Paper text:
Prokaryotic sodium channels are homotetramers, in which each monomer contains six transmembrane segments and is homologous to a single eukaryotic pseudorepeat. As with the eukaryotic channels, their S1–S4 segments form the voltage sensors, and the S5–S6 segments from each polypeptide chain associate to form an eight‐helix bundle that constitutes the pore. The selectivity filter (SF), which determines the channel's Na+ permeability over other cations, is formed by the close association of the P loops from each of the polypeptide chains.
In this study, we analysed new crystals of the NavMs pore that contain only sodium ions and diffract to higher resolution (2.7 Å), enabling us to identify the sodium binding sites in the SF. The NavMs sodium channel pore protein was purified and crystals grown in the presence of sodium ions. The pores in these crystals are in the open conformation, with the activation gate at the intracellular ends of the transmembrane domains of all four monomers splayed to allow ions to exit the pore, as in Bagnéris et al (2013). The locations of three highly occupied sodium ion sites are seen in the centres of the selectivity filters, with ion B‐factors similar to those of the protein atoms. Densities attributable to partially occupied water molecules are distinct and can also be seen within the SF and at the bottom of the SF/top of the hydrophobic internal cavity close to the local anaesthetic channel blocker binding sites (Bagnéris et al, 2014). The sodium site nearest to the extracellular surface (NaI; top cyan ball in Fig 2A) is located close to the site that had been designated S1 in molecular dynamics studies of the NavMs pore (Ulmschneider et al, 2013). Below that is the site we designate as NaII, which is closest to the carbonyl oxygen of Leu177, and is separated from the NaI site by ~2.8 Å. NaIII corresponds closely to the site denoted S4 in the MD studies and above the proposed SiteIN. It is nearest to the carbonyl oxygen of Thr176; it is separated from NaII by ~5.6 Å. An important finding is that there are no protein atoms within the normal outer limit (3.5 Å) for a sodium ion coordination sphere (the closest is Oγ1 of Ser179 at 3.79 Å from NaI), suggesting that protein–ion interactions are mediated by intermediate water molecules.
Author numbering:
A (entry chain B): 131 to 220
B (entry chain A): 131 to 222
C (entry chain D), D (entry chain C): 130 to 220
Write the structure that this text describes.
C-alpha cells in the first residue's frame, strides 16, 4: 500500500513533468507549468472531460497525444483502484 | 457501515458549511446557501463536471480552491466505495 | 449635435450600470458584481453578442422580469449608436 | 477618398495584429500565437462574433486590462467599415 502510493506519486510527477514539456507552449492553461499539469492529470485520472474537454483539443495540434493520455489513464486508474482496495483489505 | 455512513454525513455537512462561506458570494448558483452547497458537493463526489464545470471556474477567482475540492473528492469517493463494499460483505 | 448624443449615451450607460449592479450584482457577480463589470456587460449587450443565450436567459431563471430592463436598453442603445454614427458622417 | 480609408483599415489591422500577438500570443496561442492567427481573430472581433463570451472574457481571466485593447479596436473598426461601405455606395 505504502509502496503502491509511492509508485503512484513518482508516475504522477514524471507524467506532469512530461506533459509540461509536450503541451505547455500550445496549451498553457492546462499544462503551462508543473502546477497546472499536476491538476490537469488529476482531472484526466478522474475521467472528467478527459476527451471532449482536454485530449480532443490537444490532438488537433499534437495528433499522437493519445499515446501519452490513453496509457496514462490505463495506468493511474488501475493503480488507484488497486490502492483503494488495498487499504480496505489491510 | 452505520458509523461509516455517519462519518460521511458529518464530513458532507461540514464541507457544505465551509463551501457556503468560501464560495457563496462569488458563486451563488452553486454555493449561495447550504442546500445549493450540499447538491453541488454531491455532484463533485460523483465526479460529474467537477473540474470543467465547477472547480476551474471557481479557481479563476479563488486560485487555491483545489486545496478544498481535491481532498474532498479523495475523502468522499474512498468512503463511498468503502461503504458500498461494506454493505455487500456484511450481507454474504 | 453629436456631442449631446455622445453625452446622453454616457449618462444612460452610467444609470443602467448602477441599476444592473444594484439589481443583479448579488445573484450574478461575474457580470454585474460592480460598476466596472456591469459597464463591460452592458457594452457586450449593446453589440448584441450572446445577449440572450449567454446573459439574459440565465438572469431570467433568477429574475423573471429582467427582460423589462435589457430589451428597452437594447432598443435605446442600438438606436442612439445608429444616430451617433450617422451624425458623425453628416458633420 | 475610399482608397485612403481602405489603406487606413489595413495599417490599423496590421498594428493591432502585431500588438495582439505580442501581448496575448504566449497565453492564448490558438487565437493570437502569430500574425496570421491574430489577423483572423481581430476580423472575427470586428464582425462582433463571440467577441466577448468566446474571446475577451477568457483573455481577461489572465490579462484583466485586455478590455482597453479590444473595446477601442471594436469602436474604431466598426466605425471605419461603416464609413467605407457607405463611401463606396455614394461614389
Ligand atoms: C494525485 C495528486 C494531485 C495533486 C494536484 C495538485 C494541484 C496543484 C494546483 C496548483 O498548485 N495550482 C496553482 C495555485 O496557485 C492550480 C493550477 O492548476 C492553476 O494555476 C490553473 O488551473 C489555472 O488555470 C487556474 O486559474
Ligand atoms: C482499448 C484500446 C484503445 C486503443 C486506442 C487507439 C487510438 C488510435 C487513435 C489514432 O491512431 N489516431 C490517429 C493518429 O495519427 C487518433 C485519431 O482520433 C485521429 O484521426 C484524430 O481524431 C486526432 O488526431 C485529432 O485530429
Ligand atoms: C461606456 C462604454 C463601455 C466602456 C466599458 C468599460 C469597461 C471597464 C471594465 C473594467 O474596468 N474592468 C476592471 C479591470 O480593468 C473589467 C472587469 O471588471 C470585468 O469586465 C471582468 O474582468 C469581470 O466580468 C470578470 O468576472
Ligand atoms: C418586439 C417585442 C418584444 C417583446 C418581448 C416581450 C417578452 C415577454 C416575456 C415575458 O412576459 N416573460 C414572463 C415573465 O415576465 C418571460 C418569459 O416568457 C420568457 O422570456 C423566459 O423567461 C422563458 O423562456 C423561460 O423558460
Ligand atoms: Na465517471
Ligand atoms: Na462531462
Ligand atoms: Na463526465
Ligand atoms: Na452572435
Ligand atoms: Na453567438
Ligand atoms: Na451581430
Amino acid at each position: 500500500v505504502g509502496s503502491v502510493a509511492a509508485l503512484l506519486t513518482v508516475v504522477f510527477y514524471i507524467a506532469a513533468v512530461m506533459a509540461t514539456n509536450l503541451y505547455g507552449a500550445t496549451f498553457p492553461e492546462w499544462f503551462g507549468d508543473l502546477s497546472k499539469s499536476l491538476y490537469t492529470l488529476f482531472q484526466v485520472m478522474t475521467l472528467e472531460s478527459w476527451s471532449m474537454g482536454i485530449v480532443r483539443p490537444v490532438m488537433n495540434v499534437h495528433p499522437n497525444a493519445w499515446v501519452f493520455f490513453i496509457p496514462f489513464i490505463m495506468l493511474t486508474t488501475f493503480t488507484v483502484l488497486n490502492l483503494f482496495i488495498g487499504i480496505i483489505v489491510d
